[PDB]
Amino acid sequence: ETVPLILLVPKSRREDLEKAQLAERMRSQFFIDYGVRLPEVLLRDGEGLDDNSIVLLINEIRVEQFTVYFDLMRVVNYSDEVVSFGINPTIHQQGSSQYFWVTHEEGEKLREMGYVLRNALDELYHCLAVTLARNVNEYFGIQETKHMLDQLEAKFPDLLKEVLRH
């Protein structure tokens, strides 16, 4: 890989993320989990970028925008019982999926009650790995479709007749 991954980050978080060595954390973890070598990961200030937002660019094209609450912890196996403990999560919603976040102090209480918590940087890594994995799956899917159009012996009218039937 010769083209770097770029993460646009909030201007107020950039120096903390550099001090936390986010780039090396990401590169190191991805290699251990997958055996694949990420290109260099560069952080850049995102103009107008609100807090808790990260934009992934590859080859200067926007790939995905993540919502990660830098000062909070993600409740990985969140259940509604959390609320019965007096803890009301920060909820982020992306499509059909909800993500539940709590304070560091709340996180420590939930860890004693069977919950698993991920800090923001670990969740940011997780978001990247999920995005990278989703894109690879779809790429393979495109290839499967090309193979089916190669193997296809039925013509279009006959093919479309069969589809409406079933």
Author numbering: 358 to 523
Task: Give verbatim excerpts from the published study on this entry.
Protein type III secretion systems (T3SSs) are organic nanosyringes that achieve an energy-dependent translocation of bacterial proteins through the two membranes of Gram-negative organisms. InvA is a member of a set of several inner membrane proteins that form this core of the T3SS. Highly conserved across pathogenic bacteria, as well as with a conserved homolog in the flagellar system (FlhA), InvA is critical to the functioning of the T3SS. InvA of S. typhimurium is 685 amino acids in length and the N-terminal 300 amino acids are comprised of seven transmembrane helices.
To begin to address some of these outstanding questions, we determined the crystal structure of a C-terminal fragment of InvA to 1.9 Å resolution. The construct 356–525 produced crystals that diffracted well and allowed the high-resolution structural determination of roughly half of the InvA cytoplasmic domain. The biological significance of this dimer is uncertain, as the protein migrates as a monomeric species on size-exclusion chromatography and the buried surface area of this interaction is less than 500 Å2. The two copies of the protein are very similar, with a root-mean-square deviation in Cα positions of 0.8 Å. Two regions of the protein contribute most to this variation: the C-terminal helix of the truncated construct and an extended region of 30 amino acids spanning residues 370–400. In this latter extended region, covering two helices and a loop, there are overall small translational shifts in the helices in the alignment and in once place, involving residues 390–399, the long loop between H2 and β2 adopts very different conformations, both of which are well ordered in the electron-density maps. Interestingly, the first InvA subdomain (residues 358–417) also has a core with two α-helices and a three-stranded β-­sheet, two strands of which are parallel. The folds are distinct, however, in their topology, with one domain having a βαββα fold (strand–helix–strand–strand–helix) and the other having an αββαβ fold (helix–strand–strand–helix–strand). The second InvA subdomain falls into the former class.
